[PDB]
Design a protein around this ligand. Sequence first.
Ligand SMILES: *[C@@H]1O[C@H](CO)[C@@H](O[C@@H]2O[C@H](CO)[C@@H](O[C@@H]3O[C@H](CO)[C@@H](O)[C@H](O[C@H]4O[C@H](CO)[C@@H](O)[C@H](O)[C@@H]4O)[C@@H]3O)[C@H](O)[C@H]2NC(C)=O)[C@H](O)[C@H]1NC(C)=O
Ligand SMILES: *[C@@H]1O[C@H](CO)[C@@H](O[C@@H]2O[C@H](CO)[C@@H](O[C@@H]3O[C@H](CO)[C@@H](O)[C@H](O[C@H]4O[C@H](CO)[C@@H](O)[C@H](O)[C@@H]4O)[C@@H]3O)[C@H](O)[C@H]2NC(C)=O)[C@H](O)[C@H]1NC(C)=O
Ligand SMILES: *[C@@H]1O[C@H](CO)[C@@H](O[C@@H]2O[C@H](CO)[C@@H](O)[C@H](O)[C@H]2NC(C)=O)[C@H](O)[C@H]1NC(C)=O
Ligand SMILES: *[C@@H]1O[C@H](CO)[C@@H](O[C@@H]2O[C@H](CO)[C@@H](O)[C@H](O)[C@H]2NC(C)=O)[C@H](O)[C@H]1NC(C)=O
Ligand SMILES: *[C@@H]1O[C@H](CO)[C@@H](O[C@@H]2O[C@H](CO)[C@@H](O)[C@H](O)[C@H]2NC(C)=O)[C@H](O)[C@H]1NC(C)=O
Ligand SMILES: *[C@@H]1O[C@H](CO)[C@@H](O[C@@H]2O[C@H](CO)[C@@H](O)[C@H](O)[C@H]2NC(C)=O)[C@H](O)[C@H]1NC(C)=O
Ligand SMILES: *[C@@H]1O[C@H](CO)[C@@H](O[C@@H]2O[C@H](CO)[C@@H](O)[C@H](O)[C@H]2NC(C)=O)[C@H](O)[C@H]1NC(C)=O
Ligand SMILES: *[C@@H]1O[C@H](CO)[C@@H](O[C@@H]2O[C@H](CO)[C@@H](O)[C@H](O)[C@H]2NC(C)=O)[C@H](O)[C@H]1NC(C)=O
Ligand SMILES: *[C@@H]1O[C@H](CO)[C@@H](O)[C@H](O)[C@H]1NC(C)=O
Ligand SMILES: *[C@@H]1O[C@H](CO)[C@@H](O)[C@H](O)[C@H]1NC(C)=O
Ligand SMILES: *[C@@H]1O[C@H](CO)[C@@H](O)[C@H](O)[C@H]1NC(C)=O
Ligand SMILES: *[C@@H]1O[C@H](CO)[C@@H](O)[C@H](O)[C@H]1NC(C)=O
Ligand SMILES: *[C@@H]1O[C@H](CO)[C@@H](O)[C@H](O)[C@H]1NC(C)=O
Ligand SMILES: *[C@@H]1O[C@H](CO)[C@@H](O)[C@H](O)[C@H]1NC(C)=O
Ligand SMILES: N[C@@H](COS(=O)(=O)O)C(=O)O
Ligand SMILES: N[C@@H](COS(=O)(=O)O)C(=O)O
Ligand SMILES: [Ca+2]
Ligand SMILES: [Ca+2]
Ligand SMILES: [Cl-]
Ligand SMILES: [Cl-]
Ligand SMILES: [Zn+2]
Ligand SMILES: [Zn+2]
Ligand SMILES: [Zn+2]
Ligand SMILES: [Zn+2]
Lengths: 694, 694
Amino acid sequence: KHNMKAFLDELKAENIKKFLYNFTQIPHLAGTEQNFQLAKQIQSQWKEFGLDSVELAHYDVLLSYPNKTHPNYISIINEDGNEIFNTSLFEPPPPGYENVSDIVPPFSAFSPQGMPEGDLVYVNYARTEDFFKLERDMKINCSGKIVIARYGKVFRGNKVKNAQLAGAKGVILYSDPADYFAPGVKSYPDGWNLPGGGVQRGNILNLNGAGDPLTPGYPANEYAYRRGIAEAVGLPSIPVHPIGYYDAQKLLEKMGGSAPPDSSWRGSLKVPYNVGPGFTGNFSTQKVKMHIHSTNEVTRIYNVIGTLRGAVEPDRYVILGGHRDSWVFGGIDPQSGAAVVHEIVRSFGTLKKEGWRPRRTILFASWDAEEFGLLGSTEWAEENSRLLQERGVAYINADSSIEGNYTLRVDCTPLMYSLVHNLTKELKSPDEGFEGKSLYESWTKKSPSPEFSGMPRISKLGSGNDFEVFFQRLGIASGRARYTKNWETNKFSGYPLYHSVYETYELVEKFYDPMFKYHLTVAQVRGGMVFELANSIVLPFDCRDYAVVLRKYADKIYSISMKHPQEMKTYSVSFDSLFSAVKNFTEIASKFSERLQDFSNPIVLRMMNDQLMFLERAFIDPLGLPDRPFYRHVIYAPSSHNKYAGESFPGIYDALFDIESKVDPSKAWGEVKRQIYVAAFTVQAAAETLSEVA
Amino acid sequence: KHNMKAFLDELKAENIKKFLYNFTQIPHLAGTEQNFQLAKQIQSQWKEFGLDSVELAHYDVLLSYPNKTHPNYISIINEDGNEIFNTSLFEPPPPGYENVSDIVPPFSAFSPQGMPEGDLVYVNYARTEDFFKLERDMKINCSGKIVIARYGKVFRGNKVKNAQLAGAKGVILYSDPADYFAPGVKSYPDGWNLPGGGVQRGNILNLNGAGDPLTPGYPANEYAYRRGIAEAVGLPSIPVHPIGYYDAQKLLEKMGGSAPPDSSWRGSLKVPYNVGPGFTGNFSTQKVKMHIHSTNEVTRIYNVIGTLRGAVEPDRYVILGGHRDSWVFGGIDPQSGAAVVHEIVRSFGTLKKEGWRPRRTILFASWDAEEFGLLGSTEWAEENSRLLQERGVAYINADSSIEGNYTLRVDCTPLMYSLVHNLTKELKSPDEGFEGKSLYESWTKKSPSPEFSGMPRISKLGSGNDFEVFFQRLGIASGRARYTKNWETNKFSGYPLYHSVYETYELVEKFYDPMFKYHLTVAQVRGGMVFELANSIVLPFDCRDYAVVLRKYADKIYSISMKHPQEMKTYSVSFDSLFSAVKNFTEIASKFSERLQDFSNPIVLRMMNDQLMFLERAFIDPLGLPDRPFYRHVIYAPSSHNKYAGESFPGIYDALFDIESKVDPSKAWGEVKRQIYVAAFTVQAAAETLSEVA
Ligand SMILES: *[C@@H]1O[C@H](CO)[C@@H](O[C@@H]2O[C@H](CO)[C@@H](O[C@@H]3O[C@H](CO)[C@@H](O)[C@H](O[C@H]4O[C@H](CO)[C@@H](O)[C@H](O)[C@@H]4O)[C@@H]3O)[C@H](O)[C@H]2NC(C)=O)[C@H](O)[C@H]1NC(C)=O
Ligand SMILES: *[C@@H]1O[C@H](CO)[C@@H](O[C@@H]2O[C@H](CO)[C@@H](O[C@@H]3O[C@H](CO)[C@@H](O)[C@H](O[C@H]4O[C@H](CO)[C@@H](O)[C@H](O)[C@@H]4O)[C@@H]3O)[C@H](O)[C@H]2NC(C)=O)[C@H](O)[C@H]1NC(C)=O
Ligand SMILES: *[C@@H]1O[C@H](CO)[C@@H](O[C@@H]2O[C@H](CO)[C@@H](O)[C@H](O)[C@H]2NC(C)=O)[C@H](O)[C@H]1NC(C)=O
Ligand SMILES: *[C@@H]1O[C@H](CO)[C@@H](O[C@@H]2O[C@H](CO)[C@@H](O)[C@H](O)[C@H]2NC(C)=O)[C@H](O)[C@H]1NC(C)=O
Ligand SMILES: *[C@@H]1O[C@H](CO)[C@@H](O[C@@H]2O[C@H](CO)[C@@H](O)[C@H](O)[C@H]2NC(C)=O)[C@H](O)[C@H]1NC(C)=O
Ligand SMILES: *[C@@H]1O[C@H](CO)[C@@H](O[C@@H]2O[C@H](CO)[C@@H](O)[C@H](O)[C@H]2NC(C)=O)[C@H](O)[C@H]1NC(C)=O
Ligand SMILES: *[C@@H]1O[C@H](CO)[C@@H](O[C@@H]2O[C@H](CO)[C@@H](O)[C@H](O)[C@H]2NC(C)=O)[C@H](O)[C@H]1NC(C)=O
Ligand SMILES: *[C@@H]1O[C@H](CO)[C@@H](O[C@@H]2O[C@H](CO)[C@@H](O)[C@H](O)[C@H]2NC(C)=O)[C@H](O)[C@H]1NC(C)=O
Ligand SMILES: *[C@@H]1O[C@H](CO)[C@@H](O)[C@H](O)[C@H]1NC(C)=O
Ligand SMILES: *[C@@H]1O[C@H](CO)[C@@H](O)[C@H](O)[C@H]1NC(C)=O
Ligand SMILES: *[C@@H]1O[C@H](CO)[C@@H](O)[C@H](O)[C@H]1NC(C)=O
Ligand SMILES: *[C@@H]1O[C@H](CO)[C@@H](O)[C@H](O)[C@H]1NC(C)=O
Ligand SMILES: *[C@@H]1O[C@H](CO)[C@@H](O)[C@H](O)[C@H]1NC(C)=O
Ligand SMILES: *[C@@H]1O[C@H](CO)[C@@H](O)[C@H](O)[C@H]1NC(C)=O
Ligand SMILES: N[C@@H](COS(=O)(=O)O)C(=O)O
Ligand SMILES: N[C@@H](COS(=O)(=O)O)C(=O)O
Ligand SMILES: [Ca+2]
Ligand SMILES: [Ca+2]
Ligand SMILES: [Cl-]
Ligand SMILES: [Cl-]
Ligand SMILES: [Zn+2]
Ligand SMILES: [Zn+2]
Ligand SMILES: [Zn+2]
Ligand SMILES: [Zn+2]
């Protein structure tokens, strides 16, 4: 038989191991020849594996690279302008790779050039609330200062945006052992911890969904008109550079001024964590000087797009997509995901050779330039937005398969909650002490839902990965699944070796997943989701699960507003319309489910499948969110304070944010109420797409 | 049999006569009780006629009315401030109606209140080019002046916008016998000509598609948040009032300053047509004073929405829509269209009673508040935009069935060209001297295509009617058809009695269509289009007709650019990408047509029907056009100089408009090229929706 079990059994941990090894021997930096070579290899193998067609889609996008002959670094500069301390020019390469060429040294992609010098202020994680604490409570002024912030908690671009708006003239990012060194485990190469010479790369753009900075709205094709650099989307206006904790120790040890406001501001280094500004009296004339010479350049990138035509509904598209470009070797990020995708393709191609075709078309993507702002996925979706809008059933992402070995981590639309619960009950757990138990049982046990008993946690979709354009801009049902670690508050932080040269094949084979059984579990979850979305006669979405979270989000937003009862009186701020819309959505969803259960008629079915397919679509507002035209989903958006985090009713949330500080409370509360109207309307409108059609 | 002939034969000219009589006995001004009464009657009759459901959809929108106890008028004011001439407070009511109450006196809907006084400048039609001539060539300054403009050529809101941006402090609109009095025919009641006391009402908003000024983007429902009046969309900032040609004679006769630049500036009045500013020396201290006291008020309006459920594709919608509200009696505008719609409904309901159902759902609409800015249609489409987007096959408008009795007038998307040619070859001509001839033959003879031999003219869609939100904002294939007059350059002018109290049932029965045979022909064209769209197994759209006009529009835009060969060299302005996209669209369209001809498979069919249905949709850009977010169609938009006229490649057209006058030619030409990219891309993207789907 050709059913899901046949698909699933054909997947092998050994194949995923081999692919991972193969994809991680050299660096595959976006825009470089070696990543073009690997694109061509993936394209050739997906053809060999059986796909009906496999093409490269290329674009010319703004990327960013250090100057090879003019290295970036930071100095402590004495009063005569002698540079008495220099941060490192590279990370000490790992054993056996100390002769790899073309390892990009640590840098912040899209930093402007500059050599600012001044006094340090230490800003903790550089969160919105950390700047509130500094400026509001401690009355510390970041204007003309160089901020040094620790990585963790939030997306690094938000930190740089927050620093810039506090008036900083430069940002230094470092990894603190508090966030990137787990107690009792050894530094790479002898464990999975970050060495003091290890550095996290990453871009620091604030694109808000735009894709290529130069071509918002439209694919960066051969005839594209490009914005001038000065009108580019999302570029930081101050120099930024990242460092390891040996270098950071050196920069923080001398710091004076005010003490840390409390213990949540202290990392694990044997330094005071003085906020500053500047150094203690003896070194008070010493300054910090950045040297940043990176350049932004329009560079060609390549997505691999494979197509497996559907037997019955070829004009319906289930997309499995993940990136191929890496900072250096990509041993976790992304090749542990890409190797899983390669084996999924192999498996579907095995059944295809035996004469099987999925019911719907499956599209497989190897995205380029994810690391530089989701550029490959976005430009491709901009080019194909009409097809995706009218034909896109679902998008399953496939970045890093593992970031730990503790339990499953799922972020998806409520429309896939049931699909995921059901599939995980059919899969074996690979965890120790759950042999013979389902993945559902181990996941639910290790990662319990905060609201429901005997349910696992599933999180909301924000941004920080290639699903973003499909879900947030286009409104296509999206999901992702990976293995993760226990470490609670380290959620948006990363694993220790994230974006460092130390992220290697050996890292994975030795310390994460020696048997490739977590990878295999992840391939079963991703591939199984895709198989069901692509082959189930009725789309496997439960609209009633959306009704349930909509009420939870309404309760939550209402409780946030209700911290301001006097203003809700004065300005007549009612949530009645939103709760009404949610009630209607619940009732109408329930009736649709009855009909879906209660109908040999392919038109009713497809009509009903179209209703299911367009329900996620219905949450899109074509006017987008305020000042964020590419974030169009009214229920979810990437948090304005942390793009990695999903926020619910983002328009009302931001209208309420820090409202007690607004100068015109009438205008601010009027906007809260505008946003309530927009959300109530959109919920009601999405509900009506599920009513009888005529 | 239940086929199109059965539908068509069931339509009767006598029924349309009776409905017209019934709809035109009292005024039906948007927002008044009598128009709510008529909505309820239409709703009751459409139920009696057989529709599956018939509902009222109501909204609270910004409307505008004169103050009943404080009438609007204009004065010539002497130097002591004595008002020595007063324009009329009402039009002399027609025979037999001189006791009708509730006849709204002439006014410009949405004029702000004011009593400006100053000197006249006469601005011809107040077109963009007439202001160019005045200011550029004649060096006449409209700043602080009261402009008097003649109606005709362009939408009155454009005139008021043009006057406002020339710095005018008030606008006076009048009807000139040159434009509104045909040689050799008698004034109402003894002919169809405009009397000197007759006045054209109409709003003067510049909404650019927004709908209700207070709620752009969202339906003006019960919980809507409304913009403050000061942020309202499209409101004029200077007082405006319209007058008849007796009153205008009085205002123009004394005018001095500069003479008319040429004979195209002279109407038919026995006056000099001096541009001014001000009066000739003897009356040089006399001024013109406006008295405007109209108020803008949020007022409830009612659409009637009737549904005839489809037998096979109930989730596909063919819409026949036209307005019900009138300035006064609406004898032509709109009740001659609305009576045609009523009889179409009756006929489809006749077949429905005999057990027939169309293949697709047909929706029938009686829109409210069209006269005040397409408010009813727009708010309904804003409310239902997700259903319309994913399910809307086509929209057929149904305003005035006749504006003359010479020949057929069709404006539609290229996607309906073939449908229209074929249907008209099957219909009898009602024209004198074409008895036994097809409507196609008489129409083609009287209204030849400028490019093709033995083809009729079909025009492009702009705005100025209820199809606007469906086509320009949403991208649903749209069409309209009516009988019209010969009078060439009187195209966007109107017939003489347009928007005057004199537009009565008797006007029609006596001077336009005594046998109701033009009405009947129009009902056959509108109803027949709807019947085919709703019942043909393959949607009756020919994508190849779009390929043909796209090349014509590209040639045209390119020729406009080529008036500036030096700048096209200097700035490297190439149209290659646009011609390339058009070539691809042509080739891909041709192949799609072959497949459409060449496939018992309902999935391939519907897949193919979805491709046809989404092709118009593909021309929408979700970023909209520059500063006009509700005009989203890239191929067509209402002309920025005349909203009644469709423009092709409007983004490039406006980027090129008056470009030789721009201060930064590099920036202006850079924008031309941006717009070329946007159009080439969108054409290519629409072509790819017609490629094999996988
Ligand atoms: C959830 O679904 C329900 C449908 O079951 C829907 O209920 C609708 O609510 C609206 C808003 O309350 C109702 O609107 C009323 O409509 C009647 C005519 O049907 C009008 O006369 C009412 O206006 C008068 O009263 C108002 C309120 O006191 C005054 O402000 C106003 O000036 C008038 O005097 C009013 O417009 C509508 O009838 C129901 N429809 C039903 C029950 O079928 C509800 O709105 C949905 N929720 C959301 C958020 O969409
Ligand atoms: C109409 O349809 C045709 C498809 O038949 C489509 O043709 C495509 O045109 C693009 C743009 O010319 C071609 O792009 C080239 O692609 C190759 C790889 O396939 C690249 O190597 C090329 O880049 C080099 O050359 C450029 C031009 O001299 C340089 O600027 C560049 O730096 C590189 O050196 C180039 O990107 C594409 O291959 C074809 N596709 C085909 C024939 O299948 C055409 O674009 C469509 N028209 C529109 C408006 O979409
Ligand atoms: C990764 O695996 C690929 C595919 O097997 C290897 O590429 C092949 O290598 C052989 C030997 O050079 C050639 O004959 C083929 O042309 C390659 N096939 C392709 C590109 O499809 C590749 O060498 C492996 N890379 C590493 C680092 O082991
Ligand atoms: C940090 O790096 C700088 C730059 O390479 C070093 O300063 C340079 O030293 C050379 C040789 O002595 C001089 O000729 C240059 O003028 C210096 N460049 C400067 C000041 O920009 C500096 O020695 C390094 N600091 C440490 C502690 O190694
Ligand atoms: C997950 O599985 C549950 C249990 O099988 C599915 O719910 C059943 O679906 C069948 C088929 O329609 C119904 O007859 C049962 O009544 C359902 N049982 C319930 C609701 O407890 C559910 O549909 C699955 N979810 C998917 C496929 O998304
Ligand atoms: C227009 O025609 C309608 C429908 O026949 C007439 O309305 C009906 O009038 C009779 C007599 O008053 C009533 O019994 C019905 O209640 C009405 N039916 C409806 C509203 O469906 C209406 O009187 C006619 N109007 C004019 C001006 O002739
Ligand atoms: C035009 O209308 C105005 C306003 O009705 C007339 O002037 C008014 O005349 C009355 C009675 O004589 C005065 O008490 C008011 O003070 C006047 N109103 C003004 C000047 O605003 C005027 O007579 C009319 N002009 C003509 C020629 O009929
Ligand atoms: C208008 O009528 C023409 C002539 O009948 C239709 O074109 C024919 O369509 C049939 C059925 O597919 C083909 O077999 C013929 O080859 C076509 N003849 C041509 C192109 O000359 C055309 O499809 C009609 N247009 C519609 C229905 O939109
Ligand atoms: C790298 O360093 C210097 C800076 O002037 C110079 O040799 C070269 O232009 C730089 N490369 C760039 C800016 O791409
Ligand atoms: C912060 O300090 C700088 C010093 O010049 C100043 O420009 C800025 O206004 C200060 N901000 C405030 C208001 O504390
Ligand atoms: C894998 O699991 C074991 C058991 O808890 C743990 O000691 C080890 O640290 C895990 N690997 C990683 C990278 O977390
Ligand atoms: C009509 O005229 C006067 C103007 O002050 C007054 O009686 C009344 O308020 C007006 N009505 C309005 C402004 O609606
Ligand atoms: C037109 O005349 C007015 C008179 O005050 C003036 O304000 C305006 O600048 C003039 N426009 C020009 C530049 O001719
Ligand atoms: C109707 O047609 C006749 C014949 O040409 C013409 O004289 C008459 O003016 C027409 N009616 C109108 C309103 O044009
Ligand atoms: N995955 C990336 C790039 O994502 S984003 O910056 O483009 O959101 C990272 O977190 O660095
Ligand atoms: N049909 C109308 C209202 O149209 S528009 O002003 O809203 O475009 C008229 O021309 O007056
Ligand atoms: Ca782009
Ligand atoms: Ca609105
Ligand atoms: Cl992922
Ligand atoms: Cl019309
Ligand atoms: Zn990644
Ligand atoms: Zn990454
Ligand atoms: Zn009308
Ligand atoms: Zn009208």
